[PDB]
Design a protein that fits this description.
sugar binding protein; Jelly Rolls; 7-stranded antiparallel β-sheet; homodimer; 12 strands; mainly beta; 0% helix; ex vivo crystal; Galectin-10
Chain lengths: 137, 137
């Protein structure tokens, strides 16, 4: 029932789209496992990133974009709704002005659009998780 | 021919021991894949770490120890012998005073012993790599 990780899926997004991910960190929070979700402009892994969401479980979350190969202004959050050793459900909704990140049904992070979500062609979910579900509305 | 990752093996070390790892990052350096090698005091993942070696490919290496659950003084290196998109051979040798880390046959990092290497009971190799070989002399 596990999906391969790194997980790559071609995707198209617009206002109203939701990306839902169900997974579990591979190790305890003391070990600082990571989760990364990247919305790419092309199927290639080295392409630009419209939205980069990286969790360091139990510590912090960083968000950014990678434009013409360069990381832009990093946004950091210490909000940590993820629970040690538990399965999580993460949903990323495309709103007119921003992305809204729900964790286990709780609004947890937002990121204003820097590039139109229509530029997205691929989503990659990777780092230290097992993945059971991935869906795009 | 691939080994499972995270990879955990019971181990005993002393002066003269060598831990050899052969693997490949799962993604390009632009994506900053990580490699982590931890020498633990017990088979449990949450146990103390005598030697923590973490690579952020193309950026930096950090080394530390985790004693009674707390990270101690971090050591950082910008030395980056690892090559983008290539298979690497990493060897960690236990010398009387320190660990010596060879990357593709080149001495690349050292870390003075903070705890006797005889305290090690397990080695864990994890993060964003595929692993083809793991050996302890």
């Amino acid at each position: 029932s596990l999906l391969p990780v790194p997980y790559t899926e071609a995707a198209s997004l617009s206002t109203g789209s939701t990306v839902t991910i169900k997974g579990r960190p591979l190790v305890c929070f003391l070990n600082e496992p990571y989760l990364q979700v990247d919305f790419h402009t092309e199927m290639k892994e080295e392409s630009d990133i419209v939205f980069h969401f990286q969790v360091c479980f139990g510590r912090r979350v960083v968000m950014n974009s990678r434009e013409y190969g360069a990381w832009k202004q990093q946004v950091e959050s210490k909000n940590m709704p993820f629970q040690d050793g538990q399965e999580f459900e993460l949903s990323i909704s495309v709103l007119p002005d921003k992305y809204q990140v729900m964790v286990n049904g709780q609004s947890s992070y937002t990121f204003d659009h820097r590039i139109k979500p229509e530029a997205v062609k691929m989503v990659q979910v990777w780092r230290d998780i097992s993945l059971t579900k991935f869906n795009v509305s």
